[model samples]
Target: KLANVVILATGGTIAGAGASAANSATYQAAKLGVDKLIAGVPELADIANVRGEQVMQIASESISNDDLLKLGKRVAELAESKDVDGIVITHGTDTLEETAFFLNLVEKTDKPIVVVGSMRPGTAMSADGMLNLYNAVAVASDKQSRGKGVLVTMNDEIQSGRDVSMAVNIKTEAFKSAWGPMGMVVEGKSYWFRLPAKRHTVNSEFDIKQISSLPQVDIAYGYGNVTDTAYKALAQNGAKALIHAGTGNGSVSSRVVPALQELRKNGVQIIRSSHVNQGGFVLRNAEQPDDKNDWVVAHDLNPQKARILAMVAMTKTQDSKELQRIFWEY
Candidate 1:
């Protein structure tokens, strides 16, 4: 079916250009504007009624919480209007999951919002942007893709932004959805069998339209030699919530566990996430008596992305159970 599609283009590696294929790691751009990028992907015209908006042009790693609020608010505004049928965002890969999760938590809309990015730059001989963009457009235009929260499309797989994480570095197929993707997009059409029913924009009490500022989140990594001092330092520095980037399966080193527990006792929320990529992390009570400890686990979310979720989750409620539900559901 034909529909009106708006491509919110924010520059990422997809819009990047390196000196050569051998070096896709670095590329500069003043010419990779939304219009130009859209023009490069002429095939999108056949998918739906297409238009472009340049939201920002930056690498994904540099994306701030402010950017997420801005983007989420903008998408909510657009989705409220009848003029826009669906939305597609081209974002940096480094933090795409965080942005998608933020949008899922705050924005209220049924219209599909699909986020897409490419590992290969537009200049590469085997550039992945064209197909990724095409699939995003296709998914956005599909009526069935709505009410599924935000989606990330890369390397021919369509995943719930909630369940997927960038698992690899320097590869075209960098993302992996733990329970597998929500579905797949093949030959420019979406095949969806699963749906998300957790707390999301449609069911969220925290509205993006009313939010003027987003909470600050800080992440600290756990290592072979983590110290309680680091946890204390994060809480002292005014971190609303701390996402502990723990070891395998979200394990906290013996040295830092006590400090995290102490922070939780002081009302500084703690979420445990894995430093490792791919798969997911389990929470405290799932395996152990976390209720007694009072610290929440990050569950499937990575540490960086968990911080974003914790910030948004904190916006509505502070109850640990509620926060854990937010982590579990969303």
Candidate 2:
């Protein structure tokens, strides 16, 4: 018997449209609707008894806290349904990792949840969406995908949504995870290999059902001769927490240190994350004293992922201790 899978369409490059077949890089994203996307892929019925829901139509970069909350609520509802065996999210590649990580941390379900996207528009010559979506549905329907945290099916690989990020924009292999894929999907079947060490999905303490709203968390990029301008301005703009997208072991410049300390003193939470993509984490107290400053480190999470967690965590507790514990756990 085929499993019941719901493809929650949030709009992304997978639903994009280009003027001509050659216009791969130049096109409007989120042009196609859920019905059109499903109709375009007829073989999805062979993988699972699929249903589509049009959640939103917007570029992933424009996805805000409100959109996340709206999407999260819908996911929880479908996960609770007895007829829904699995779930697939068609999201924009730009911020797919962030959304997937947020769902991994909060959604309380053992059913498989997969997030998939295509680097090239469907109208392009070598569109990846049809197969990417196919693989996502295949994984979502398979029992092996259950309780593995949210999954990302891209380029025929199954990745942990918590660890995967979009590394390459133009190529089909855009999404990658530092720890590597959990397995691979081929011909509507899945092969298993690894599992996540961190708490997620059913094991996570967070629940999207309980979260009423997401907090305002922003990220400030760190660089050479970096002033405290972005950091200070973000804090003043009512940012509940600020992600320091730092460089070189997540170091904080002296110029930015004063403002960070001031922000922390003024009840703003600070977290340190890195921009480097060597799959290395920015350790706490590696440069600045995390203990002394009472700031939290993002561990291996990128700035965007950190921001997702920070907002989700801040919704429950604003204390840096609680926030730090969450950072380490999820």
Candidate 3:
């Protein structure tokens, strides 16, 4: 039997078009709809019974929380249908990781859910969209891809939704996972090396149906002489949680520590995450007095990714200990 795959198209460079074949970097995005995208890739028919839907027609940077909820709910709805075997989302690369991680926490089924996009526009020189789209559908249809958390397939490598990030710009080989990719795809075949150990998808305690809206969480940058003004304003303006993108092992400057402590006293949650380059764990007591201050640490998650986890976790619980556990598990 043929695998049934549904492509949810949220526009990106994959749908973009340039003035000529030579133009690669500069182009208009979100120019094509789902139907047009699928039509461009005829090879998809050989792999699965494919269908397409235009879930949104905007760049990923413009995606808001409301958009996230709508897309997530739609994905969840499709997952419940017996006719659907796998799902693929075509999104703008700019914010693709955020959406992937968000879906990783809320999806209830183990059916393959792969998010894909391209660096160059569909009409540009050495365009990557068609092949990437094909690979995405291949991953979605493959039975092995099921039960793995939401996956991102790009540059022929399969990455975990929780760990993948856009590491570079203007390269066909972008989107890297910090701990290395889970697997790779070659000639329409998937090769596995490791699977995600953290709680995700069917194992996730979070359900998108239960969340009508995500809580308001903000990220504050940390530097040598940064002030408390950003933190103060965010707290005063009704942010439920604030992520401090600190330097080194999520270290907060002495100047900002007292202010963060005050925010915590007033009942706002603070998560310490690293602004440093990839692959270091954010320890609670080593860098900052996380234990003394009643704060949560982001562990290996970077600031942006940490903010995504914090927002979703906030919907379920506000207790620092519970939030900390959520971070560790999911």
Candidate 4:
């Protein structure tokens, strides 16, 4: 029997369009509907009992916290149903990693959940969405993908949703994971090589079914000659927690350190994360004293990812220690 797979289309470049075939880079995103997207790929019928649902029609950069909750709630409902075997989310490439990481931390099911998008519109020459979507369904339908956290299929590689990020925005092969891809999908088949080590999906402590709201979290970048302006502004603007996208090894400048210390004292949770691309390993007390400052360090998580984790972790515990442990584990 074939597996049952649901494609949850939240809109992105995968569903985008342009006036001319050469207008790949010049098109408006989220231009097409889910039904049209599904119709563009008839070969999807050869795999599973495929179906598409329109969740939302906004660009991922515009996707907000409420959008995540609405989508998460829908995913939880379908994952618990008897008929569903796996799930796939079509999202914009800009913020796809954040949404994927959020779902990996919050959704509790072990079912395969693949998040995919395209760098170019389906109307463009040499478009990548059709093949990417096919690979996503191939992985989503296979039992091998079960209990492997959420997955991302792009350019024939199966990446952990927890680790993959869009490195180069202008190319078709944009997504990558620091630890490497978990597997690959080719011609409607999946090849396994490894699995994700972090706590995710079924093993995750968080549950979308229980989370009614994701508290406000913000990220502040670190750089040469940086001041404490963004940090103080974020905390004052109602950011429950602030993620410091610090310099190497998550270092804090003397100029910004005082403001972070004061922000934590004023009740905002402070998290230190690296701004480095590919991978950044931020250890506690390496640059600044995490224990002394009562702040948490985002271990191996990029700044945006750290923000995702900070928001999720804050939902359960506000304690810096517990938050640190969650950062280390997830």
Candidate 5:
């Protein structure tokens, strides 16, 4: 008997086409359906009993919060079936990291849910879609991938959905593991290296079953001339939490710290995350009294993804301590 794997094709550059090589970036992709793309990848047959679903056939840039809820709910439903062993999602590179983080926050079960995409489209001469899809299938079917958070596979590297990001603008291998990938996959097998031990879906206080609305989370950049106006405006417009896409070490301009402190007093939550692309953000208590100010730190999460986590985290607990524990556990 073979293990079941479902590929939820959400659309990305991998499924895109262009008039020529130069137009690949501007031209639309993911216009093609999952079935067509699946048929294009003959190697997937060697990995698992694969099937495809056309969940959404739009560029990943167009994917919305509602889309994530739908995708996550579907993956959870699939994982519940005894026949299903793993799931894969083909998403747009523009927002792939955000969606992965969003799903990691909500999806239940210990089954593998890997997100994969390509730097080049299937129409390109050196197309990467087939290889990415094939690797995703391999990772999804690997028993070792169970119990891990969402995984993103690209360039033969298997990354923790929590730590992977598209750091470069254009290249065949665009994604870089922000804190380094969880592991690598070679020749259709996953090579286990590190494990993610953060507060995540399977162990979170908030469950996907209870999620209804994804709240508004805004990001504010830290700069030398930073002002409190942006922070003030976000709070004024009912922003539940603000993710500070801060400078190195999650530092904020000293001028704006007081304003953020004020925001915390009024019930809004603050998460200090890095504005930089590749490294993890640090929020040491000795450097700043985040605990005293009731602001949260997005340990290694990029600001955009941190916003998604904050939105989900806010749904269940508002107590800073509970939020901290939630941050640690999920």
Candidate 6:
């Protein structure tokens, strides 16, 4: 019997349309439904026993915390079914990494979960959505993909959801992994060079069934001469955690350090993360007094990803030590 692969379609550029085949950049996103997307890709039937569901029909940028919870619960529910072997999610490139990382943390099953998107709409002269969708299904149907954390397949490269991020705009090869991709797909075959070492999916302590909602964790960007206004506003507005996107090595400016320390004193968890480079790890007690302020450091995670981890970590505990351990593990 063929392996079963379910495609959960959340609208993005993969479902977008243009006025003409030449208008790739100037197209409206989230224009097509799940059935239409599946109908456009007949090759999917040759790979697996494929099925499609319209999870949502909005652009990924409009996706909210409520949507993340709903999508994650649906993924967990499908993973428990004996009939389902793997799953794929079609998402927008704008916020696709965020959703993929979110699923990687809460997904409970070992079955493959692949996230895919396209830079150009289906109406373009050389549209990439069809092949991207095909590769997504191929990765999901492969038995080797099981037990790997959520995968992102785009431009023939397979990336760990935890490490992949969009690096360019209006380009076919937009998605890139900071530590390099885990593998690549060539003509329906997956070739893996490395596997993720951090805790994810089945190994992750977080479970979507137990989580009814995610905490409000915000990101504050760092720059020279930047004020603490954004940090202060987030704390006053009921933020449970704050991810400080510092310059290098999660460096915090002297001007903003006092406010961050104060926020930590006032019961807001402060996680220091880097925004300058992708590959370096953020060390605690290096640039900032992480030991003195009792703050957590995001090791290798970008600010956006660090924010996701913080939100999920807050659900289990508020202690800085526990949160720091969670960051290191996951």
For residue 35, model 5's alpha carbon misses the true position, in angstroms, by: 0.8
TM for candidate 6 is: 0.98
- Poorest lDDT segment (10 consecutive residues) of candidate 2: 277-286
TM-score of 3: 0.98
* Model 4 lDDT, full chain set: 0.90
lDDT of 3: 0.92
lDDT of 1 by residue, 250-317 (tens): 77777777777778888888887787666646756654357887778877777877887888778788
Clash list (residue pairs), candidate 4: none
After aligning candidate 5 to the native by TM-score, how far in Å is the CA of 275 from where it should be? 1.2
**Pairs with steric clashes in candidate 6:** none
RMSD of each: 2.1, 0.9, 0.9, 0.9, 2.0, 0.9
- Sum up the clashes in candidate 6: 0
Candidate 3 colliding pairs? none
lDDT of 1: 0.80
Instruction: Give me the runs in candidate 3 sitting further than 4 Å from their true place.
Output: none
User: Residue 218 error for model 5, in Å?
Assistant: 0.9
lDDT accuracy of residue 204 in candidate 2: 89
- Candidate with more favorable, higher TM-score: 3 or 5: 3
lDDT of 4 by residue, 116-149 (tens): 9999899999999999998898899998999999
Give the higher-lDDT candidate: 1 or 2: 2
For candidate 3, write residues 111-177 as lDDT tens digits: 9999999999989878999999999999999999989999999999999999899988899888987
Score every model by TM-score: 0.92, 0.98, 0.98, 0.98, 0.92, 0.98
**lDDT tens digits, residues 1-330, model 2?**
999999999988899999999988888899999889989899998878999999999889899888998999999999999999999999999999999999999999999999998888889998999999999999999989989999999998999999899998798988888899889999988998998999999998889988877888899998889999999899888898999999878899998998999999999999999898659888878888989999999999999999999988887887888888999999
Q: For candidate 3, what is the total of clashing residue pairs?
A: 0
